Design a protein around this ligand. Structure first.
Ligand SMILES: Nc1ncnc2c1ncn2[C@@H]1O[C@H](COP(=O)(O)OP(=O)(O)O)[C@@H](O)[C@H]1O
Ligand SMILES: Nc1ncnc2c1ncn2[C@@H]1O[C@H](COP(=O)(O)OP(=O)(O)O)[C@@H](O)[C@H]1O
Ligand SMILES: Nc1ncnc2c1ncn2[C@@H]1O[C@H](COP(=O)(O)OP(=O)(O)O)[C@@H](O)[C@H]1O
Lengths: 365, 365, 365
């Protein structure tokens, strides 16, 4: 059976018989804006994130997915086509597939997504599973509160003894792309300017390399405003040097207290405490000291040691607080997908073609 | 032969060849309220007070027994199944059993209870015995007035020279569970709130730990309203501190003068005097100075020294009054059950299978 | 004398010489989140529900009161200041005032509330009265069971011949704000999203306009899933149309069987039957057929005709059941406040300054 993590930002896919994905590519569809001045194939009508990442510049870049909701399904179907035929060389009619989505999403999403997945690609069996549950499979726990944070979605789910508290789930649409745009908007403080889609991938790669989360933001500010040498240099692809300072932390720190973005919500530590405070009074002792981090934007160095200091300053004292931040968080959800796909007891739960032929797309409910 | 104290509140069981029970667990059956988000065996259809006490939170809690009357027999049969197979590891067809009940109860109770006990578990021999009689066995007296007070039932039986006066027995359905709910309803005076079954066990454990009976309630009220330091603190399972004051006594004191509950009856001291005043005129001298306390809710510190001062203020003077409050009152009825089960002369009194095959369940009468 | 209904949600105030309040405004205090880019007076340090309702967007909105308990008294004192000086144009030192509260509340509330009311505003005389009693004044009955349901509190009080049974009162913290948040959490099923305080008032006004209570919820569900045209459209303040269907009832219906919210209590019909079953056996015949509904969230169309069908299915047959749902339920408690304030025989019951100068704030007891 195939496991495809159509999370936002990049697609990750492979077989359930493996410990890591076989494909990891940036989910972009890119289209040329200039005509072919010399005869050849070298100006295709469209490119997908495998090759559109390197032919950027002459291409505009648009994602099929935003805030975890698919905006144009033809781009997504093109990406699934690339994942099945071009990358894993596999006929989708041969293999069952399971697909990930955010916990709360417009229900029509699941309906269209399955209608495509086995009316067009005619896959034999299908199942949709929420990412936070799959992350626990990857950790192998049965009690815990999972936090996920990727491109444009953050959410949390409490689970105890394998039971989720659906009244205690939260979304918080703050992570990633809304945080890259802040880097774009703060980096113009130095003077550098970045205006276009292909040029944004530079700012993304900057953020993926030159970023750390301060444990005491006020004192890092007081240090970087001193004579301290804290800057590092980045070479742009044309050879222009970039120096970054007073910014390597002041970007990711806006994941906490997101009033810097004018988002009037509570932040990641607040919504972690405010999710545990929705659970029953004796569940707190076992969700505390089992906080599990997941997903790309949890990868900055120093996250866990700040988050722990924030929660411990906020939760009632005389309670053990531990944050389970493993490595490989980027793949955690796919690993758990491979696990759940492999468990023999789960094999009765797939929606088969026979069910959909009776019920149609609302069988997902 | 087995002795099982299926009194209300918690089940206590063991062999007659012992001085204390081998099992003591809260008689609860608990059921999940949330569907399964994660795969496993870890969510049985039902749990019993051994594990439902710790898996509370994810469970609703319902007792099979209320006011000493069984409300749902399938929950009780599940508890007997747990006591025989799971807890005492004993084949019920091997051993006779004796079972306790309240003195006055709907007769259909005894009928169903024995029908189950040796039509289903097919026990070889059976007997039902009233708790107050069994308590005298535990004290070893043959003259006395016994008071019992447990989860939801209080009653009294006078016995002289081993004879009970059935015209002088009283029930008074005031103890225990109706007194925890009053703590729940008075503790909201501080501001704390407790709404649900699992959360009530916290208030029960509070009551089991932070309670004392005032000898001069009016003066303890006048003291706690003074500058006196009289509060104590309880840590909830989440680490929230609770402070309790002007309440640690004002809860159990409602066992006397139950007009605080709007129950228009007389109270425990009144119904003790009003039971002795039903006995013959020369029996008073020997029921006085042989008052025997029994059952859980007689365990609060200061009970006996109040009760003596109340009865002595009410009974005619120039009479010696003594209250036999031993330790181990919690087990007293089970101890007496073990005694009566051990006496060889009693061994002719069990109802055998041969009797029931003639008479059916009404053979208990 | 003034009558101020400082119930939760919105403040309603006026003179006892009137049949309806003179002020009705949403009790919000709002504070700016942005520094001044343009010169003027137009950004006060704080605003109150008169103007903070229209300057929302640029304001954060916080209530002083939640679950009927005041959380920050300075916001409340600011609201009382606005009601006396700014709205009713009245010197508080001239007039006695009576104030409403929920039946069970932390006692410190009444103490602080009166300390403020005539240590700061220096009112000459003061009295606190429970809302359910005041509702009977508005109906003019002397026997009845009153149900109240507003912003964040529901409770019930039985009264017979003008006497309440304090052992039979219940709170049930389910109404209103916990039911708007459910609309926020169910409306994301369509795809629309609402994240912030000012934006929540839109969902509240939706609920106040596009809501009805189904008499047979299962059949309305079966109808809305058909081809039936049952949706209605709401225009947002920006002109975005919203269509709502299969939801206009599935929100308020969660006031019954609140397991949809994961609140493990019984619901409004259950706690109405379970309150009458605490009264004496001959009172039932006269509390039945005098159930009186009160307070805002009882205003949905179809409530009464469902509630009657629920109670009649549950109460013993051959009993007349009638629900007294008058119009003007929103003002009922204030009307009764005006009545009780006007009765000359009541005029001895106010706490005067002379009493408080001896007793301090606990004179309310
Ligand atoms: N090394 C890194 N450290 C921190 N964040 C990263 C790193 N690499 C990628 N990211 C973040 O993750 C995004 C890539 O997609 P991601 O959100 O991880 O999708 P998914 O969660 O589905 O894997 C990047 O745009 C970036 O915001
Ligand atoms: N240490 C204690 N002091 C006072 N009361 C107690 C104590 N422990 C238990 N109780 C009361 O006894 C109840 C336990 O069941 P109980 O009524 O004793 O049943 P039984 O009488 O059948 O043993 C508790 O709910 C509590 O009300
Ligand atoms: N027309 C209406 N129909 C149903 N419910 C309403 C209506 N108007 C207001 N409400 C409910 O009443 C709330 C307003 O405050 P309310 O609870 O009535 O306070 P009070 O009971 O003190 O007047 C609103 O938030 C809403 O939940």
């Amino acid at each position: 059976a195939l496991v495809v993590d159509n999370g936002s930002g990049m697609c990750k896919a492979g077989f359930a018989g493996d410990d890591a994905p076989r494909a990891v590519f940036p989910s972009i569809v890119g289209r040329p804006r200039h005509q072919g001045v010399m005869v050849g194939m070298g100006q295709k009508d469209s490119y997908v994130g495998d090759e559109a990442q390197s032919k950027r510049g002459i291409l505009t870049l648009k994602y099929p997915i935003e805030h975890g909701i698919v905006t144009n399904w033809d781009d997504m179907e093109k990406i699934w086509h690339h994942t099945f035929y071009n990358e894993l060389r596999v006929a989708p009619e041969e293999h069952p597939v399971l697909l990930t989505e955010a916990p709360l999403n417009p229900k029509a999403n699941r309906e269209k997504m399955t209608q495509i997945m086995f009316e067009t690609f005619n896959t034999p069996a299908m199942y949709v599973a929420i990412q936070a549950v799959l992350s626990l499979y990857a950790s192998g726990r049965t009690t815990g509160i999972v936090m996920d944070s990727g491109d444009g979605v953050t959410h949390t789910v409490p689970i105890y003894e394998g039971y989720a508290l659906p009244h205690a789930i939260l979304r918080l649409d703050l992570a990633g792309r809304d945080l890259t745009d802040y880097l774009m908007k703060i980096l113009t403080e130095r003077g550098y300017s970045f205006t276009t889609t292909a040029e944004r991938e530079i700012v993304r790669d900057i953020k993926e390399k030159l970023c750390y989360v301060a444990l005491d933001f006020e004192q890092e500010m007081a240090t970087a405003a001193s004579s301290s040498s804290l800057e590092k240099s980045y070479e742009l692809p044309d050879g222009q040097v970039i120096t970054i300072g007073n910014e390597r932390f002041r970007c990711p720190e806006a994941l906490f207290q997101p009033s810097f973005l004018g988002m009037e919500s509570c932040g990641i530590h607040e919504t972690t405490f405010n999710s545990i405070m929705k659970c029953d009074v004796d569940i707190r002792k076992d969700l505390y000291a089992n906080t599990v981090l997941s997903g790309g934007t949890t990868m900055y160095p120093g996250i866990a040691d700040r988050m722990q200091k924030e929660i411990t300053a906020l939760a009632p004292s005389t309670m053990k607080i531990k944050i389970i931040a493993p490595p490989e968080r980027k793949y955690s959800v796919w690993i758990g997908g491979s696990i759940l796909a492999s468990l023999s007891t789960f094999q009765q739960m797939w929606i088969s073609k026979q069910e959909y032929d009776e019920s149609g797309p609302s069988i997902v409910h």
